[PDB]
Amino acid sequence: VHPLPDSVPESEDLFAPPPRMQGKEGRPKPHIGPNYESYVKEWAKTVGPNSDEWWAAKARETLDWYDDFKTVRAGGFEHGDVQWFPEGTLNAAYNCLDRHYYKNPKKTAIIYEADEPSESREVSYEELMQETCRVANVLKSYGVKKGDAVSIYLPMTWQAAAAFLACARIGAIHSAVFAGFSAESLRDRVNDCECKVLITTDEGRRGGKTIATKQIVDAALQQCPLVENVLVLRRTGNKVPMTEGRDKWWDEECAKMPAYCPCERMASEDPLFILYTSGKPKGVVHSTAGYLLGTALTLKYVFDAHPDDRFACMADIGWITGHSYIIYGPLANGITTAVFESTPVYPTPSRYWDFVDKWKATQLYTAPTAIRLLRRMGEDHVKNHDLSSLRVLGSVGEPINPEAWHWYNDFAGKNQCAIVDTYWMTETGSISIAPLPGAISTKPGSATFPFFGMDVDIIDPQTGQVLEGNDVEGVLVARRPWPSIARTVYRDHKRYLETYMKPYPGYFFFGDGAARDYDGYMWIKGRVDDVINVSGHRLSTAEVESALILHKGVAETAVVGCADDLTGQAVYAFVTMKPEFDTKEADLSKELAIQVRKVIGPFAAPKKIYLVSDLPKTRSGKIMRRVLRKIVAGEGDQLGDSIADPQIVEEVKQKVT
């Protein structure tokens, strides 16, 4: 097991857990706290030679079992025979519904925030359980048996959770297809899993717009010879084509069925679901006990969930984030979870914050792209909200840039929430690296430290060897299986082994580069700068960038730091001009430096300043500051990469050279 830091010393780059995460002002005392060493003390129990005791206790405390397990773990990466709690039997729907309904039937399971705010409402655990049971009985009437695949093409209405959990209740293997997918993408996933049954809607609604799901379904199913039954949810009631025999209305089928259904006794390692990635699509297969446990534990510790919290994950159930942090994680824990059907700016950019104040959301889990869009829309939509019910603000998707991080921290959090950067993928099942909000001091853009059960290291790809120490960079690997790791790729285990297990034998290969900084913090896809120290002057990329943007001809700018034998660190700037601008190029690099000095002072000049045609960006619009930083460090050849306009990196490489 790779040792973590003994301690993390204080510094002006660390954001210590704020009062709401200290059990102050009436907030729940955090599960893990109050400092780095408290996280390490508990985490050390979850990896290494004595961790079976911790995992056996956590599994028996977190989940209800029909049969106890005897063995904690077995198997490994080499052959893809990972086993957790193998002799145990349980049911995911029993753990997400039944046991809570028996304790408090009227507790809210789902906050359904409809596309039109006026149509939003609460769904009790009882109501959710009854709809799940009805749908499960409908599936059984179709002949769906334990182990059969069932495709789900559903938009973000609360019944999506019933659809998922009905498959789980009877031991079917649900395969959720994102409701924005085209007919060809839907077709390819429905064929590959060989399901005979599809659950979908007549239409979806999102951002005041209609998604024509049934129209798309009909197109795909023309090339899907095995699908015999389609269960159609009446989300909008508008006229849509229905195929006699094949297609049946959700409401009419469920009305024939009783509102209870027994739970199938599933082995820990029976498959729970297939989820296709977005070569050809691969069905990542997750089993039951270990996946369910990982999501329940991660939701509890990474977001410091307590029994009455109201968790708002603004993702989609078609992706692993929705599987894990809308449905399975929070319902396993018996709390309230949000199914959010709209966009961040429908009807207005105030939508997230009205939501948070209406339901008193205690945690929010969103994507940097939504944060960037709300920043673009301005402070008026957010600054006069209350938002104090929030304790933790989480980030998921691409690694976040400091500018979105600070906007999140300042405006959504009002500098009173812990910001939880999370790193994981469909194949890890649950969050792999993230701060525990009550214990870890944060750095903008950094995932910090591995979660319980995660033993990660950094490998030099040019040598294959583990890199020891802090301030190292390479590719991220995991030394041992964890309970929620994916067990195979559906009917293509060879692809599972070659992709994840072959490149670094003995390790799980995430596919991402990472850096471990001098404090031991993890930096997925590279370190990103926030405050840079040029000759004892603490300047932020934000300060420098907004000084540059004052030049009336400047369109976009991104600033990075790098070591410097004169000023300790130095500031390198990349600037793009607006097209209304014609002015020799060197007389511009001299004109912007003077402009930065006029605003910030003589020692705030960037050491170098590169005029480029555009900034390197991903398809989401995110500026690739981490790449710009590596290029300045001299690692343009050690970059990697699948994004927007690869000529720009070569352009940027040519200008810095």
mmCIF file of all heavy atoms in Angstrom, residues 403-436:
data_model
loop_
_atom_site.group_PDB
_atom_site.id
_atom_site.type_symbol
_atom_site.label_atom_id
_atom_site.label_comp_id
_atom_site.label_asym_id
_atom_site.label_seq_id
_atom_site.Cartn_x
_atom_site.Cartn_y
_atom_site.Cartn_z
ATOM 1 N N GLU A 403 -11.439 29.029 -11.971
ATOM 2 C CA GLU A 403 -12.386 30.127 -12.120
ATOM 3 C C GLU A 403 -13.819 29.653 -11.877
ATOM 4 O O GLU A 403 -14.611 30.350 -11.230
ATOM 5 C CB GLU A 403 -12.240 30.763 -13.496
ATOM 6 C CG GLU A 403 -13.154 31.945 -13.701
ATOM 7 C CD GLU A 403 -13.075 32.497 -15.110
ATOM 8 O OE1 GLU A 403 -13.609 31.839 -16.029
ATOM 9 O OE2 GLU A 403 -12.475 33.583 -15.296
ATOM 10 N N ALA A 404 -14.163 28.461 -12.374
ATOM 11 C CA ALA A 404 -15.453 27.875 -12.038
ATOM 12 C C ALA A 404 -15.501 27.459 -10.569
ATOM 13 O O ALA A 404 -16.535 27.611 -9.905
ATOM 14 C CB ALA A 404 -15.736 26.691 -12.956
ATOM 15 N N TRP A 405 -14.386 26.943 -10.049
ATOM 16 C CA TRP A 405 -14.310 26.539 -8.648
ATOM 17 C C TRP A 405 -14.593 27.723 -7.727
ATOM 18 O O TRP A 405 -15.419 27.624 -6.807
ATOM 19 C CB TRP A 405 -12.926 25.927 -8.373
ATOM 20 C CG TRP A 405 -12.735 25.239 -7.035
ATOM 21 C CD1 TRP A 405 -12.746 23.894 -6.795
ATOM 22 C CD2 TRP A 405 -12.472 25.867 -5.773
ATOM 23 N NE1 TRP A 405 -12.517 23.647 -5.464
ATOM 24 C CE2 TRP A 405 -12.349 24.841 -4.814
ATOM 25 C CE3 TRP A 405 -12.358 27.200 -5.353
ATOM 26 C CZ2 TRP A 405 -12.111 25.104 -3.460
ATOM 27 C CZ3 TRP A 405 -12.118 27.457 -4.005
ATOM 28 C CH2 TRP A 405 -11.998 26.415 -3.079
ATOM 29 N N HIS A 406 -13.928 28.863 -7.976
ATOM 30 C CA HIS A 406 -14.146 30.051 -7.152
ATOM 31 C C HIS A 406 -15.570 30.590 -7.293
ATOM 32 O O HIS A 406 -16.174 31.003 -6.299
ATOM 33 C CB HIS A 406 -13.125 31.142 -7.492
ATOM 34 C CG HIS A 406 -11.745 30.842 -6.992
ATOM 35 N ND1 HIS A 406 -11.466 30.633 -5.657
ATOM 36 C CD2 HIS A 406 -10.573 30.679 -7.652
ATOM 37 C CE1 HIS A 406 -10.180 30.362 -5.515
ATOM 38 N NE2 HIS A 406 -9.616 30.387 -6.710
ATOM 39 N N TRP A 407 -16.120 30.611 -8.515
ATOM 40 C CA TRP A 407 -17.512 31.038 -8.687
ATOM 41 C C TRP A 407 -18.459 30.141 -7.890
ATOM 42 O O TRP A 407 -19.386 30.619 -7.219
ATOM 43 C CB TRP A 407 -17.892 31.026 -10.173
ATOM 44 C CG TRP A 407 -19.225 31.691 -10.473
ATOM 45 C CD1 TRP A 407 -19.412 32.971 -10.907
ATOM 46 C CD2 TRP A 407 -20.539 31.118 -10.345
ATOM 47 N NE1 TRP A 407 -20.753 33.232 -11.061
ATOM 48 C CE2 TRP A 407 -21.466 32.113 -10.722
ATOM 49 C CE3 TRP A 407 -21.021 29.866 -9.942
ATOM 50 C CZ2 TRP A 407 -22.852 31.894 -10.713
ATOM 51 C CZ3 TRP A 407 -22.399 29.650 -9.931
ATOM 52 C CH2 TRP A 407 -23.295 30.659 -10.315
ATOM 53 N N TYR A 408 -18.246 28.825 -7.985
ATOM 54 C CA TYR A 408 -18.986 27.863 -7.181
ATOM 55 C C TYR A 408 -18.841 28.176 -5.699
ATOM 56 O O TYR A 408 -19.836 28.286 -4.967
ATOM 57 C CB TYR A 408 -18.445 26.471 -7.485
ATOM 58 C CG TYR A 408 -19.387 25.307 -7.332
ATOM 59 C CD1 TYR A 408 -20.759 25.448 -7.509
ATOM 60 C CD2 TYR A 408 -18.885 24.037 -7.035
ATOM 61 C CE1 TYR A 408 -21.613 24.342 -7.381
ATOM 62 C CE2 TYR A 408 -19.718 22.938 -6.906
ATOM 63 C CZ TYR A 408 -21.075 23.091 -7.080
ATOM 64 O OH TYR A 408 -21.881 21.984 -6.950
ATOM 65 N N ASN A 409 -17.591 28.326 -5.245
ATOM 66 C CA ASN A 409 -17.307 28.519 -3.828
ATOM 67 C C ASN A 409 -17.867 29.845 -3.331
ATOM 68 O O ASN A 409 -18.426 29.914 -2.232
ATOM 69 C CB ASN A 409 -15.795 28.457 -3.589
ATOM 70 C CG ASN A 409 -15.431 28.570 -2.122
ATOM 71 O OD1 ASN A 409 -15.927 27.813 -1.289
ATOM 72 N ND2 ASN A 409 -14.576 29.532 -1.796
ATOM 73 N N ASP A 410 -17.728 30.900 -4.134
ATOM 74 C CA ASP A 410 -18.156 32.236 -3.728
ATOM 75 C C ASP A 410 -19.675 32.369 -3.741
ATOM 76 O O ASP A 410 -20.266 32.905 -2.799
ATOM 77 C CB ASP A 410 -17.553 33.288 -4.657
ATOM 78 C CG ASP A 410 -16.051 33.389 -4.548
ATOM 79 O OD1 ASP A 410 -15.468 32.892 -3.555
ATOM 80 O OD2 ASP A 410 -15.453 34.001 -5.457
ATOM 81 N N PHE A 411 -20.326 31.932 -4.817
ATOM 82 C CA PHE A 411 -21.720 32.304 -5.010
ATOM 83 C C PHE A 411 -22.702 31.218 -4.596
ATOM 84 O O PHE A 411 -23.681 31.513 -3.907
ATOM 85 C CB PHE A 411 -21.953 32.712 -6.461
ATOM 86 C CG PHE A 411 -21.284 33.992 -6.817
ATOM 87 C CD1 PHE A 411 -20.098 33.996 -7.529
ATOM 88 C CD2 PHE A 411 -21.826 35.193 -6.419
ATOM 89 C CE1 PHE A 411 -19.470 35.170 -7.844
ATOM 90 C CE2 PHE A 411 -21.215 36.371 -6.738
ATOM 91 C CZ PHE A 411 -20.031 36.362 -7.446
ATOM 92 N N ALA A 412 -22.469 29.969 -5.000
ATOM 93 C CA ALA A 412 -23.327 28.897 -4.516
ATOM 94 C C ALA A 412 -23.063 28.613 -3.044
ATOM 95 O O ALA A 412 -23.997 28.316 -2.285
ATOM 96 C CB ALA A 412 -23.127 27.639 -5.357
ATOM 97 N N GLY A 413 -21.799 28.706 -2.621
ATOM 98 C CA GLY A 413 -21.422 28.321 -1.276
ATOM 99 C C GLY A 413 -21.348 29.483 -0.312
ATOM 100 O O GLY A 413 -21.361 29.288 0.911
ATOM 101 N N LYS A 414 -21.268 30.695 -0.862
ATOM 102 C CA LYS A 414 -21.035 31.912 -0.082
ATOM 103 C C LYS A 414 -19.848 31.746 0.853
ATOM 104 O O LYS A 414 -19.836 32.261 1.975
ATOM 105 C CB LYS A 414 -22.288 32.325 0.688
ATOM 106 C CG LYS A 414 -23.356 32.871 -0.208
ATOM 107 C CD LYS A 414 -24.499 33.397 0.597
ATOM 108 C CE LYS A 414 -25.629 33.820 -0.321
ATOM 109 N NZ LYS A 414 -26.645 34.520 0.465
ATOM 110 N N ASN A 415 -18.847 30.999 0.385
ATOM 111 C CA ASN A 415 -17.611 30.723 1.121
ATOM 112 C C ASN A 415 -17.865 29.964 2.409
ATOM 113 O O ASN A 415 -17.049 30.028 3.331
ATOM 114 C CB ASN A 415 -16.831 32.011 1.419
ATOM 115 C CG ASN A 415 -16.567 32.824 0.168
ATOM 116 O OD1 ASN A 415 -17.151 33.891 -0.032
ATOM 117 N ND2 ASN A 415 -15.702 32.310 -0.694
ATOM 118 N N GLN A 416 -18.990 29.246 2.500
ATOM 119 C CA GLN A 416 -19.333 28.516 3.708
ATOM 120 C C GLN A 416 -19.536 27.030 3.465
ATOM 121 O O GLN A 416 -19.831 26.293 4.414
ATOM 122 C CB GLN A 416 -20.578 29.141 4.350
ATOM 123 C CG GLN A 416 -20.375 30.626 4.649
ATOM 124 C CD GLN A 416 -21.652 31.360 5.017
ATOM 125 O OE1 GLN A 416 -22.320 31.013 5.984
ATOM 126 N NE2 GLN A 416 -21.981 32.397 4.255
ATOM 127 N N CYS A 417 -19.360 26.558 2.237
ATOM 128 C CA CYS A 417 -19.468 25.140 1.941
ATOM 129 C C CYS A 417 -18.093 24.578 1.626
ATOM 130 O O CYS A 417 -17.206 25.296 1.147
ATOM 131 C CB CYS A 417 -20.403 24.880 0.756
ATOM 132 S SG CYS A 417 -22.058 25.478 1.009
ATOM 133 N N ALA A 418 -17.923 23.289 1.914
ATOM 134 C CA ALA A 418 -16.793 22.541 1.382
ATOM 135 C C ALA A 418 -17.056 22.222 -0.084
ATOM 136 O O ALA A 418 -18.159 21.786 -0.437
ATOM 137 C CB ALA A 418 -16.573 21.255 2.175
ATOM 138 N N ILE A 419 -16.046 22.446 -0.932
ATOM 139 C CA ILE A 419 -16.105 22.124 -2.356
ATOM 140 C C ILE A 419 -15.450 20.761 -2.562
ATOM 141 O O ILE A 419 -14.256 20.587 -2.290
ATOM 142 C CB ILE A 419 -15.412 23.203 -3.209
ATOM 143 C CG1 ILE A 419 -15.903 24.612 -2.835
ATOM 144 C CG2 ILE A 419 -15.614 22.920 -4.685
ATOM 145 C CD1 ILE A 419 -17.425 24.797 -2.836
ATOM 146 N N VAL A 420 -16.213 19.793 -3.054
ATOM 147 C CA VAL A 420 -15.741 18.417 -3.160
ATOM 148 C C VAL A 420 -15.522 18.117 -4.637
ATOM 149 O O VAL A 420 -16.473 17.892 -5.396
ATOM 150 C CB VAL A 420 -16.711 17.419 -2.516
ATOM 151 C CG1 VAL A 420 -16.228 16.026 -2.758
ATOM 152 C CG2 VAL A 420 -16.788 17.650 -1.035
ATOM 153 N N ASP A 421 -14.260 18.153 -5.043
ATOM 154 C CA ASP A 421 -13.817 17.654 -6.338
ATOM 155 C C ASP A 421 -13.874 16.137 -6.333
ATOM 156 O O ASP A 421 -13.368 15.504 -5.403
ATOM 157 C CB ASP A 421 -12.374 18.109 -6.580
ATOM 158 C CG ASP A 421 -12.224 19.018 -7.776
ATOM 159 O OD1 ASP A 421 -12.643 18.598 -8.886
ATOM 160 O OD2 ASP A 421 -11.677 20.144 -7.595
ATOM 161 N N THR A 422 -14.465 15.534 -7.360
ATOM 162 C CA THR A 422 -14.553 14.076 -7.399
ATOM 163 C C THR A 422 -13.955 13.535 -8.687
ATOM 164 O O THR A 422 -14.157 14.102 -9.762
ATOM 165 C CB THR A 422 -16.001 13.561 -7.278
ATOM 166 O OG1 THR A 422 -16.734 13.912 -8.461
ATOM 167 C CG2 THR A 422 -16.686 14.128 -6.038
ATOM 168 N N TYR A 423 -13.234 12.424 -8.572
ATOM 169 C CA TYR A 423 -12.689 11.715 -9.722
ATOM 170 C C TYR A 423 -13.175 10.276 -9.665
ATOM 171 O O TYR A 423 -13.082 9.632 -8.612
ATOM 172 C CB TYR A 423 -11.149 11.757 -9.753
ATOM 173 C CG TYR A 423 -10.576 10.875 -10.848
ATOM 174 C CD1 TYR A 423 -10.730 11.215 -12.192
ATOM 175 C CD2 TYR A 423 -9.910 9.684 -10.541
ATOM 176 C CE1 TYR A 423 -10.235 10.407 -13.209
ATOM 177 C CE2 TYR A 423 -9.414 8.862 -11.542
ATOM 178 C CZ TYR A 423 -9.574 9.227 -12.881
ATOM 179 O OH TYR A 423 -9.077 8.412 -13.885
ATOM 180 N N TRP A 424 -13.709 9.786 -10.793
ATOM 181 C CA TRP A 424 -14.109 8.386 -10.959
ATOM 182 C C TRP A 424 -14.580 8.150 -12.391
ATOM 183 O O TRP A 424 -14.519 9.053 -13.230
ATOM 184 C CB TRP A 424 -15.205 7.977 -9.957
ATOM 185 C CG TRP A 424 -16.473 8.812 -10.024
ATOM 186 C CD1 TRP A 424 -16.573 10.178 -9.914
ATOM 187 C CD2 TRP A 424 -17.818 8.327 -10.197
ATOM 188 N NE1 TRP A 424 -17.894 10.570 -10.025
ATOM 189 C CE2 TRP A 424 -18.676 9.457 -10.194
ATOM 190 C CE3 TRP A 424 -18.378 7.057 -10.367
ATOM 191 C CZ2 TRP A 424 -20.058 9.349 -10.352
ATOM 192 C CZ3 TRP A 424 -19.769 6.952 -10.521
ATOM 193 C CH2 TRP A 424 -20.583 8.093 -10.507
ATOM 194 N N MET A 425 -15.044 6.940 -12.689
ATOM 195 C CA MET A 425 -15.587 6.637 -14.003
ATOM 196 C C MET A 425 -16.626 5.536 -13.864
ATOM 197 O O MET A 425 -16.798 4.944 -12.795
ATOM 198 C CB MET A 425 -14.489 6.241 -14.998
ATOM 199 C CG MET A 425 -13.321 5.491 -14.399
ATOM 200 S SD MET A 425 -11.806 5.695 -15.380
ATOM 201 C CE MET A 425 -11.697 4.104 -16.173
ATOM 202 N N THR A 426 -17.333 5.279 -14.969
ATOM 203 C CA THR A 426 -18.292 4.184 -14.996
ATOM 204 C C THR A 426 -17.683 2.896 -14.447
ATOM 205 O O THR A 426 -18.338 2.152 -13.709
ATOM 206 C CB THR A 426 -18.786 3.967 -16.425
ATOM 207 O OG1 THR A 426 -19.333 5.188 -16.927
ATOM 208 C CG2 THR A 426 -19.868 2.892 -16.460
ATOM 209 N N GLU A 427 -16.408 2.641 -14.763
ATOM 210 C CA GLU A 427 -15.778 1.381 -14.398
ATOM 211 C C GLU A 427 -15.430 1.282 -12.919
ATOM 212 O O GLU A 427 -15.267 0.163 -12.420
ATOM 213 C CB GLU A 427 -14.519 1.163 -15.225
ATOM 214 C CG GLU A 427 -14.781 0.994 -16.710
ATOM 215 C CD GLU A 427 -14.733 2.296 -17.469
ATOM 216 O OE1 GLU A 427 -14.839 3.369 -16.826
ATOM 217 O OE2 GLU A 427 -14.573 2.243 -18.707
ATOM 218 N N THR A 428 -15.308 2.403 -12.201
ATOM 219 C CA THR A 428 -15.051 2.319 -10.766
ATOM 220 C C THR A 428 -16.325 2.233 -9.948
ATOM 221 O O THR A 428 -16.248 1.922 -8.753
ATOM 222 C CB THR A 428 -14.216 3.514 -10.258
ATOM 223 O OG1 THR A 428 -15.029 4.693 -10.187
ATOM 224 C CG2 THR A 428 -12.978 3.763 -11.153
ATOM 225 N N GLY A 429 -17.482 2.505 -10.558
ATOM 226 C CA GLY A 429 -18.774 2.363 -9.906
ATOM 227 C C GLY A 429 -19.117 3.465 -8.925
ATOM 228 O O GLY A 429 -20.291 3.824 -8.783
ATOM 229 N N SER A 430 -18.105 4.003 -8.238
ATOM 230 C CA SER A 430 -18.300 5.066 -7.260
ATOM 231 C C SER A 430 -17.040 5.926 -7.203
ATOM 232 O O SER A 430 -16.014 5.609 -7.815
ATOM 233 C CB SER A 430 -18.640 4.500 -5.879
ATOM 234 O OG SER A 430 -17.625 3.605 -5.447
ATOM 235 N N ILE A 431 -17.127 7.009 -6.418
ATOM 236 C CA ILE A 431 -16.082 8.036 -6.375
ATOM 237 C C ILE A 431 -14.754 7.455 -5.884
ATOM 238 O O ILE A 431 -14.686 6.800 -4.836
ATOM 239 C CB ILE A 431 -16.555 9.204 -5.494
ATOM 240 C CG1 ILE A 431 -17.702 9.949 -6.181
ATOM 241 C CG2 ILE A 431 -15.406 10.146 -5.172
ATOM 242 C CD1 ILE A 431 -18.503 10.822 -5.243
ATOM 243 N N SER A 432 -13.678 7.717 -6.631
ATOM 244 C CA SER A 432 -12.376 7.116 -6.348
ATOM 245 C C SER A 432 -11.472 8.018 -5.529
ATOM 246 O O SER A 432 -10.839 7.556 -4.573
ATOM 247 C CB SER A 432 -11.664 6.746 -7.651
ATOM 248 O OG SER A 432 -12.460 5.866 -8.422
ATOM 249 N N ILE A 433 -11.400 9.294 -5.896
ATOM 250 C CA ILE A 433 -10.549 10.280 -5.243
ATOM 251 C C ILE A 433 -11.393 11.525 -5.012
ATOM 252 O O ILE A 433 -12.034 12.028 -5.940
ATOM 253 C CB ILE A 433 -9.300 10.606 -6.094
ATOM 254 C CG1 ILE A 433 -8.543 9.323 -6.448
ATOM 255 C CG2 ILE A 433 -8.389 11.602 -5.375
ATOM 256 C CD1 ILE A 433 -7.331 9.555 -7.289
ATOM 257 N N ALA A 434 -11.406 12.012 -3.785
ATOM 258 C CA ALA A 434 -12.212 13.171 -3.421
ATOM 259 C C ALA A 434 -11.873 13.549 -1.990
ATOM 260 O O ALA A 434 -11.529 12.672 -1.187
ATOM 261 C CB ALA A 434 -13.712 12.887 -3.549
ATOM 262 N N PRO A 435 -11.948 14.826 -1.635
ATOM 263 C CA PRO A 435 -11.808 15.203 -0.222
ATOM 264 C C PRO A 435 -13.021 14.769 0.577
ATOM 265 O O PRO A 435 -14.149 14.767 0.080
ATOM 266 C CB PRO A 435 -11.700 16.731 -0.268
ATOM 267 C CG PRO A 435 -12.426 17.091 -1.500
ATOM 268 C CD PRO A 435 -12.139 15.996 -2.496
ATOM 269 N N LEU A 436 -12.778 14.375 1.812
ATOM 270 C CA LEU A 436 -13.864 14.218 2.755
ATOM 271 C C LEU A 436 -14.153 15.591 3.347
ATOM 272 O O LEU A 436 -13.271 16.181 3.980
ATOM 273 C CB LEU A 436 -13.499 13.202 3.827
ATOM 274 C CG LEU A 436 -13.226 11.800 3.259
ATOM 275 C CD1 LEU A 436 -12.823 10.830 4.362
ATOM 276 C CD2 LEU A 436 -14.442 11.275 2.482
#
